[PDB]
Assembly symmetry: C3
Homo-oligomer: 137 residues x 3
């Protein structure tokens, strides 16, 4: 079932704002986009406190360089109970002080979003890393 | 000339599902998104006609990935709907290839022009023309 | 807060056409998407003539190769006075005659768009280059 244009637009804006916070080191604001008990599976982090700690930790890998998350090829579907399911491609570019760019291994991501007080929030995120999948075959 | 929001959303979902199938090695499902007699024009000038030829070409081309994982990325997409429902798009595309060792290759970028048509209410690919930017540069 | 689906679509088409022109060396057509007195902050360029000349000059860095601009993670909001504000991630790929793809340092871009005779045009563009931000911190 195709999503309504309003839902599709709302989803694009949710992800843009969520990733701007994560990439901008607003780890608490990033985690606040998740509901209590949200499941983030890379190993699972459950709930915003754990998700905030993980984003802070994973950001350590960038040192002082600047990450940017890139999403594309995103499916969006609304269930009758209002839950939104997405699947998409994601990567992170990492730009150094000298202008070098590293492109991280791509991921295939599956999300569920829920509406809380009229606004979308992340309920579940499951990340499949393409290098690990390749390695496993 | 702007596409309706419904059409724009429909196009984004068509392409997301189409590339998920191709990148996931569902070459039959990828080819099934094309109509009978669809024309697929490769960067080099070879044309594949019909979904069966397109499936065979897509499977053969995937050999270049050598067990690594491709991901197609589209961006900067124009969308135009003709009065008869035919949809024309143009966009940028590239492919990343991620290996078991975490290597990421970025393939030469392409400029792609498609036509889509509606069959029993759903979009299908009718024409795809790929211009590869390295080949364009070489000709210049 | 959320843009109408019509506005969202119009913005994607505006940017697709603007970048196709710039990447295709249609520097005048690129500049025509800006209003008179538009401000482009890299140094500031004011007006379509200066923006065209600067874009032509900047393209010299590609040296016979083919650039492609990639935007993603785009916020879109309409202000009460009809001004449209966007923020997005941008990078440029540069593909050589041998198919080597250079990936330029990423940018965080903030635009304002305005409607002129019913048509969207760029009023202001401010580019923050991520390597320079990293260097500064």
């Amino acid at each position: 079932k195709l999503p309504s244009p309003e839902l599709y637009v709302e989803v694009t804006q949710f992800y843009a704002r969520q990733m701007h916070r994560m990439d901008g080191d607003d780890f608490g604001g990033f985690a606040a986009t998740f509901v209590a008990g949200a499941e983030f599976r890379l190993t699972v982090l459950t709930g915003p406190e754990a998700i905030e700690a993980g984003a802070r930790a994973a950001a350590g890998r960038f040192d002082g360089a600047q990450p940017r998350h890139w999403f594309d090829m995103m499916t969006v579907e609304e269930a009758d109970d209002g839950t939104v399911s997405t699947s998409y491609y994601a990567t992170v570019t990492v730009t150094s002080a000298q202008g070098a760019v590293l492109v991280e291994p791509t991921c295939f991501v599956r999300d569920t979003l829920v509406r809380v007080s009229g606004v979308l929030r992340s309920r579940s995120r499951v990340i499949e890393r393409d290098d690990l999948v390749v390695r496993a075959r």
